[PDB]
Amino acid sequence: FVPDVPEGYVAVQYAHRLFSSSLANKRNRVTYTHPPTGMAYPSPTGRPH
Amino acid sequence: QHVDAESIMTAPKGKLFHLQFMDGLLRPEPSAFDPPASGEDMRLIYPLQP
Amino acid sequence: QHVDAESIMTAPKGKLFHLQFMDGLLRPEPSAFDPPASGEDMRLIYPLQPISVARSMRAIVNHNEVDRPRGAVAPSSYEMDTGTLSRNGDLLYSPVA
Protein backbone atom coordinates (compact mmCIF):
# COMPACT_ATOMS: atom_id res chain seq x y z
CA PHE A 1 0.00 0.00 0.00
CA VAL A 2 1.92 3.00 -1.35
CA PRO A 3 0.70 6.08 0.53
CA ASP A 4 0.70 8.83 -2.11
CA VAL A 5 2.42 12.13 -1.30
CA PRO A 6 -0.11 14.66 0.14
CA GLU A 7 -1.79 17.39 -1.95
CA GLY A 8 0.64 20.32 -1.54
CA TYR A 9 4.34 19.68 -0.95
CA VAL A 10 7.72 21.11 -1.97
CA ALA A 11 9.97 18.36 -3.37
CA VAL A 12 13.56 19.06 -2.34
CA GLN A 13 16.60 17.10 -3.53
CA TYR A 14 18.72 15.87 -0.61
CA ALA A 15 22.17 17.45 -0.54
CA HIS A 16 25.22 17.08 1.69
CA ARG A 17 25.05 20.86 2.13
CA LEU A 18 21.48 21.92 3.02
CA PHE A 19 22.01 20.61 6.57
CA SER A 20 24.28 23.02 8.46
CA SER A 21 25.30 23.38 12.11
CA SER A 22 24.61 26.75 13.76
CA LEU A 23 23.82 28.26 17.16
CA ALA A 24 20.22 28.87 18.16
CA ASN A 25 19.07 30.21 21.55
CA LYS A 26 21.58 28.85 24.13
CA ARG A 27 23.01 25.78 22.33
CA ASN A 28 24.41 24.23 19.13
CA ARG A 29 21.85 22.57 16.85
CA VAL A 30 21.65 20.89 13.43
CA THR A 31 19.68 23.21 11.15
CA TYR A 32 17.79 22.72 7.88
CA THR A 33 18.03 25.27 5.06
CA HIS A 34 15.03 25.63 2.74
CA PRO A 35 16.34 25.73 -0.87
CA PRO A 36 13.59 27.90 -2.47
CA THR A 37 13.35 30.46 0.37
CA GLY A 38 16.71 30.21 2.23
CA MET A 39 15.73 29.93 5.90
CA ALA A 40 16.80 28.49 9.28
CA TYR A 41 14.47 26.32 11.45
CA PRO A 42 16.91 25.19 14.18
CA SER A 43 14.51 22.64 15.71
CA PRO A 44 12.56 19.56 14.48
CA THR A 45 9.16 21.31 14.35
CA GLY A 46 7.46 23.36 11.59
CA ARG A 47 9.83 23.19 8.62
CA PRO A 48 7.52 23.45 6.66
CA HIS A 49 6.87 19.90 5.41
CA GLN B 1 10.72 15.53 41.66
CA HIS B 2 7.97 16.03 39.05
CA VAL B 3 4.22 15.44 38.75
CA ASP B 4 3.00 12.71 36.38
CA ALA B 5 0.78 13.61 33.41
CA GLU B 6 -1.79 11.08 34.70
CA SER B 7 -1.88 11.88 38.43
CA ILE B 8 -2.85 15.40 37.34
CA MET B 9 -6.04 14.13 35.63
CA THR B 10 -7.39 11.30 37.83
CA ALA B 11 -6.61 12.45 41.39
CA PRO B 12 -8.96 13.56 44.23
CA LYS B 13 -10.33 17.12 43.95
CA GLY B 14 -9.04 18.11 47.40
CA LYS B 15 -5.33 17.32 46.92
CA LEU B 16 -2.77 20.14 46.70
CA PHE B 17 0.35 19.03 44.79
CA HIS B 18 3.29 21.34 44.04
CA LEU B 19 5.11 21.69 40.71
CA GLN B 20 8.63 22.97 39.93
CA PHE B 21 9.60 25.68 37.43
CA MET B 22 12.90 26.77 35.83
CA ASP B 23 14.45 30.27 35.66
CA GLY B 24 17.26 30.08 33.06
CA LEU B 25 18.97 33.47 32.79
CA LEU B 26 22.36 32.63 34.32
CA ARG B 27 22.52 29.43 32.25
CA PRO B 28 25.98 28.63 30.81
CA GLU B 29 25.94 29.06 27.02
CA PRO B 30 27.57 26.81 24.34
CA SER B 31 31.16 27.08 23.06
CA ALA B 32 32.49 28.57 19.79
CA PHE B 33 33.36 25.62 17.51
CA ASP B 34 31.55 22.43 18.57
CA PRO B 35 29.74 19.32 17.23
CA PRO B 36 26.00 19.86 17.95
CA ALA B 37 24.31 17.33 20.26
CA SER B 38 20.85 15.86 19.58
CA GLY B 39 17.59 15.60 21.54
CA GLU B 40 15.08 18.31 22.49
CA ASP B 41 13.45 19.72 25.64
CA MET B 42 9.70 19.62 26.29
CA ARG B 43 7.16 21.30 28.58
CA LEU B 44 3.63 20.04 29.23
CA ILE B 45 2.03 22.04 32.08
CA TYR B 46 2.13 25.86 32.10
CA PRO B 47 0.57 28.23 34.67
CA LEU B 48 -1.93 30.99 33.84
CA GLN B 49 -1.78 33.45 36.74
CA PRO B 50 1.03 34.70 36.36
CA GLN C 1 60.76 25.48 27.42
CA HIS C 2 61.70 29.07 26.51
CA VAL C 3 64.83 31.04 25.62
CA ASP C 4 66.12 33.61 28.12
CA ALA C 5 66.31 37.30 27.15
CA GLU C 6 70.02 37.25 28.09
CA SER C 7 71.20 34.00 26.46
CA ILE C 8 69.93 35.53 23.21
CA MET C 9 72.38 38.47 23.49
CA THR C 10 75.62 37.04 24.94
CA ALA C 11 75.87 33.56 23.39
CA PRO C 12 78.36 32.15 20.81
CA LYS C 13 77.71 33.14 17.18
CA GLY C 14 77.59 29.51 15.99
CA LYS C 15 74.80 28.22 18.27
CA LEU C 16 71.39 27.32 16.82
CA PHE C 17 68.65 27.56 19.49
CA HIS C 18 64.96 26.95 18.78
CA LEU C 19 62.04 29.09 19.97
CA GLN C 20 58.34 28.21 20.40
CA PHE C 21 55.34 30.08 18.96
CA MET C 22 51.58 30.02 19.67
CA ASP C 23 48.67 29.57 17.22
CA GLY C 24 45.50 30.59 19.10
CA LEU C 25 42.48 30.16 16.83
CA LEU C 26 40.76 27.22 18.54
CA ARG C 27 41.29 28.88 21.94
CA PRO C 28 38.32 28.55 24.35
CA GLU C 29 36.67 31.95 24.85
CA PRO C 30 35.34 33.51 28.12
CA SER C 31 31.85 33.01 29.59
CA ALA C 32 28.82 35.35 29.57
CA PHE C 33 28.58 36.89 33.06
CA ASP C 34 31.90 36.67 34.94
CA PRO C 35 34.23 38.60 37.30
CA PRO C 36 37.26 39.68 35.18
CA ALA C 37 40.67 38.32 36.22
CA SER C 38 43.83 40.47 36.31
CA GLY C 39 47.33 40.21 34.80
CA GLU C 40 48.46 40.60 31.19
CA ASP C 41 50.36 38.59 28.55
CA MET C 42 53.64 39.73 27.01
CA ARG C 43 55.80 38.91 23.97
CA LEU C 44 59.45 39.91 23.55
CA ILE C 45 60.93 38.17 20.47
CA TYR C 46 59.10 38.23 17.11
CA PRO C 47 60.27 36.74 13.78
CA LEU C 48 60.68 38.72 10.54
CA GLN C 49 60.57 36.15 7.73
CA PRO C 50 57.62 35.24 7.82
CA ILE C 51 57.60 31.82 9.55
CA SER C 52 55.36 28.79 8.75
CA VAL C 53 56.13 27.60 5.20
CA ALA C 54 54.89 24.06 5.80
CA ARG C 55 51.19 24.95 5.59
CA SER C 56 48.76 22.89 3.46
CA MET C 57 45.68 23.74 5.61
CA ARG C 58 44.61 24.83 9.13
CA ALA C 59 41.74 24.55 11.66
CA ILE C 60 39.59 21.59 10.55
CA VAL C 61 36.44 22.63 12.46
CA ASN C 62 33.32 24.51 11.32
CA HIS C 63 32.35 27.74 13.10
CA ASN C 64 29.48 28.24 15.59
CA GLU C 65 27.29 30.32 13.23
CA VAL C 66 29.34 31.77 10.35
CA ASP C 67 30.80 29.86 7.38
CA ARG C 68 34.59 30.20 7.18
CA PRO C 69 36.36 30.43 10.57
CA ARG C 70 38.68 33.42 9.90
CA GLY C 71 42.23 32.37 8.92
CA ALA C 72 41.32 29.00 7.45
CA VAL C 73 43.33 27.49 4.60
CA ALA C 74 41.96 25.08 1.99
CA PRO C 75 44.15 22.35 0.36
CA SER C 76 46.20 23.39 -2.68
CA SER C 77 44.68 22.54 -6.08
CA TYR C 78 47.85 20.59 -6.95
CA GLU C 79 47.99 18.18 -4.01
CA MET C 80 45.00 16.61 -5.78
CA ASP C 81 46.01 16.03 -9.43
CA THR C 82 47.24 12.75 -10.93
CA GLY C 83 48.62 13.38 -14.41
CA THR C 84 49.50 10.50 -16.74
CA LEU C 85 53.14 9.72 -17.53
CA SER C 86 54.83 10.40 -20.88
CA ARG C 87 56.80 7.72 -22.76
CA ASN C 88 60.22 9.39 -22.40
CA GLY C 89 59.62 11.98 -19.67
CA ASP C 90 57.74 10.66 -16.67
CA LEU C 91 55.51 13.26 -14.96
CA LEU C 92 53.14 16.05 -16.10
CA TYR C 93 49.87 17.78 -15.11
CA SER C 94 46.48 18.03 -16.87
CA PRO C 95 45.63 20.12 -20.02
CA VAL C 96 43.84 22.99 -18.14
CA ALA C 97 42.32 23.97 -21.53
TrEMBL record, chain A:
The lineage of its organism: Viruses, Riboviria, Orthornavirae, Duplornaviricota, Resentoviricetes. The chain holds residues 1088 to 1136 of 1333 of the full protein. It comes from Bombyx mori cytoplasmic polyhedrosis virus. It comes from the Viruses. This is VP1.
